Amino acid sequence: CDAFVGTWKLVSSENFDDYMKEVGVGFATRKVAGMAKPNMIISVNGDVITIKSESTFKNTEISFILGQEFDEVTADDRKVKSTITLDGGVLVHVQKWDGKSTTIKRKREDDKLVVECVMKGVTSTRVYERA
Numbered sequence: 001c002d003a004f005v006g007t008w009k010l011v012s013s014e015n016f017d018d019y020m021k022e023v024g025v026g027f028a029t030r031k032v033a034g035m036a037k038p039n040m041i042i043s044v045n046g047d048v049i050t051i052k053s054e055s056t057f058k059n060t061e062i063s064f065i066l067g068q069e070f071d072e073v074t075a076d077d078r079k080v081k082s083t084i085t086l087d088g089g090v091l092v093h094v095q096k097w098d099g100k101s102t103t104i105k106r107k108r109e110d111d112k113l114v115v116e117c118v119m120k121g122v123t124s125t126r127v128y129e130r131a
């Protein structure tokens with residue numbers, strides 16, 4: 001996938017604190033992550049997609065191949081098993097840990113990058129626009 005290629009800036013966010021709460025993020029990290037306004041910078045070299053999120057709070061980065069499970073340390077220090085695929089133009093990213101799982105979908109919508117984060121019954125939506 002490449003229509004995702006570019007530098008993206010968070011412009012709106014709903015339910016992110018609830019989402020983080022359900023995932024199990026401690027209060028102190030929620031407070032600083034919630035206020036954060038990260039850049040998500042996505043690139044692709046052949047079959048390796050790289051995604052970087054930068055903020056004063058924390059920078060993270062993952063590089064992966066569609067369909068191949070990899071170990072991820074998250075911004076909230078969970079050690080998860082991640083598997084990201086491309087489904088009908090949507091990048092679906094799944095993280096598995098302690099028998100729990102959360103799904104993060106990234107999709108292009110007009111000129112936005114829309115991110116839907118789901119944990120159990122909570123759904124958070126985050127909108128990023130080209131910088």
Ligand SMILES: O=C(O)c1cccc2c3c(n(Cc4ccccc4C(F)(F)F)c12)CCCC3
Pocket residue numbers: 020025032033034036037038053054055057058059060074075076104115117126
């Ligand atoms: O950037 C995001 O929008 C984002 C999207 C999906 C899940 C998460 C999680 C987090 N964030 C925010 C994030 C990710 C990576 C780096 C920086 C941040 C920041 F700054 F908190 F927004 C997410 C924080 C840890 C809980 C899981």
